[PDB]
């Protein structure tokens, strides 16, 4: 997260860290046994880490649970990043509490202008590399489809939305991938892509979660 703020320990209880020996992506806990992330975060050997603040120190609220299976969206295209969504099942159910909690799926799609919360442990510089160890947060509005398409000609599908600031300075970044965009207590987006981070006229692009609720529910119900 570039240009954000320190969230505060366990203030984003649905935020998870995906760890394969090291943090590589975020995700969102959507019930006691399932996480939603980006398809471009797919890899084998994933441990889901819940209740994290400092991802480098055991602070006492963590639950470390290995993934039993991953399910990438059947229509995911890694070139265009269309359908950039993946489900991850935990080997055992997380113990839910105030600091480890699921985030509800959307009943409706959020409109342009809606204020959302984007979070993650990604790079905090738009040119440097500095990785924070504590969770970072950014409040950002969803941008209009027209402005999003104008920012990225030929690349924005109906399964994507832009959020952030055309002026730059505030954005998600590398390592935030797969993490949540939450608006009014619902998961509306997944950190997906962009051109660099926090650059003028290149806002973050996010997977449009409301298009996938049926797939998510059916997949969970049979797996
Ligand atoms: C180019 O690396 C990125 C990874 C995730 C999200 C974003 C959005 N600025 C950029
Ligand atoms: Ca920790």
């Amino acid at each position: 997260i570039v240009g954000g703020y320190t969230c505060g320990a366990n203030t984003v209880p649905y935020q998870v860290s995906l760890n394969s020996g090291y943090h590589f992506c975020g995700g969102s806990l959507i019930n006691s046994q399932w996480v939603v992330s980006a398809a471009h975060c797919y890899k084998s050997g994933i441990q889901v880490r819940l209740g994290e603040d400092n991802i480098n120190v055991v602070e006492g609220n963590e639950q470390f649970i290995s993934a039993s299976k991953s399910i990438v969206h059947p229509s995911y295209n890694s070139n265009t990043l269309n359908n950039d969504i993946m489900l991850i099942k935990l080997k055992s159910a997380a113990s839910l509490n105030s600091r480890v909690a699921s985030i509800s799926l959307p009943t409706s799609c959020a409109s342009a202008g809606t204020q959302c919360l984007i979070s993650g442990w990604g790079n905090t510089k738009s040119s440097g590399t500095s990785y924070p160890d504590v969770l970072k947060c950014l409040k950002a509005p969803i941008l209009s489809d027209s402005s999003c398409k104008s920012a990225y000609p030929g690349q924005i599908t109906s399964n994507m939305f832009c959020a952030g600031y055309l002026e730059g300075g505030k954005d998600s970044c590398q390592g935030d991938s797969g993490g949540p965009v939450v608006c009014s207590g619902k998961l509306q987006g997944i950190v997906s892509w962009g051109s660099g981070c926090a650059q003028k006229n290149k806002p973050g692009v996010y997977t449009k979660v409301c298009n996938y609720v049926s797939w998510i529910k059916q997949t969970i119900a049979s797996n």
Side-chain angles (χ1 to χ4, degrees):
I1 300 288
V2 176
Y5 57 107
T6 298
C7 304
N10 311 117
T11 55
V12 190
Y14 49 84
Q15 172 86 50
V16 310
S17 171
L18 302 185
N19 184 288
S20 65
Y22 47 88
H23 167 91
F24 70 87
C25 271
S28 306
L29 188 68
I30 56 163
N31 65 30
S32 67
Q33 206 157 12
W34 290 89
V35 164
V36 169
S37 195
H40 78 84
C41 294
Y42 167 75
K43 61 160 74 178
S44 49
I46 293 30
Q47 187 180 245
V48 178
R49 303 194 153 204
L50 313 185
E52 288 281 15
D53 189 44
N54 193 315
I55 56 177
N56 271 147
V57 175
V58 177
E59 299 180 297
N61 290 304
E62 301 93 343
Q63 298 178 47
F64 300 164
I65 305 177
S66 297
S68 58
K69 79 188 304 172
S70 284
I71 301 168
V72 171
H73 196 279
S75 295
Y76 171 58
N77 180 309
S78 56
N79 296 140
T80 64
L81 293 182
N82 196 202
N83 311 112
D84 190 11
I85 189 170
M86 174 184 58
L87 288 160
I88 302 165
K89 195 182 181 180
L90 304 188
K91 279 186 195 282
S92 64
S95 301
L96 303 181
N97 55 59
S98 64
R99 292 172 172 79
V100 176
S102 50
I103 185 68
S104 293
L105 292 180
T107 60
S108 60
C109 301
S111 310
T114 308
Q115 197 207 239
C116 307
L117 177 71
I118 308 176
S119 53
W121 286 279
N123 190 2
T124 62
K125 309 316 168 227
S126 55
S127 288
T129 60
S130 188
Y131 287 82
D133 293 337
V134 300
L135 188 66
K136 296 285 183 171
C137 277
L138 176 64
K139 292 187 170 176
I142 295 173
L143 298 183
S144 68
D145 186 52
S146 67
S147 73
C148 191
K149 281 168 161 149
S150 298
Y152 296 99
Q155 302 157 256
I156 306 303
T157 72
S158 62
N159 304 128
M160 302 170 191
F161 69 89
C162 286
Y165 301 91
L166 296 175
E167 61 265 43
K170 290 168 137 187
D171 202 4
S172 55
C173 202
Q174 181 99 294
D176 290 320
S177 288
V181 179
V182 166
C183 329
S184 302
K186 310 296 184 173
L187 184 67
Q188 291 288 351
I190 297 157
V191 181
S192 182
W193 68 274
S195 183
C197 312
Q199 302 300 300
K200 189 176 169 182
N201 292 126
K202 297 299 191 178
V205 188
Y206 300 91
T207 309
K208 188 169 192 185
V209 175
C210 66
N211 290 0
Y212 299 95
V213 171
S214 289
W215 174 74
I216 292 170
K217 293 191 181 282
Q218 144 67 171
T219 299
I220 285 22
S222 286
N223 290 94

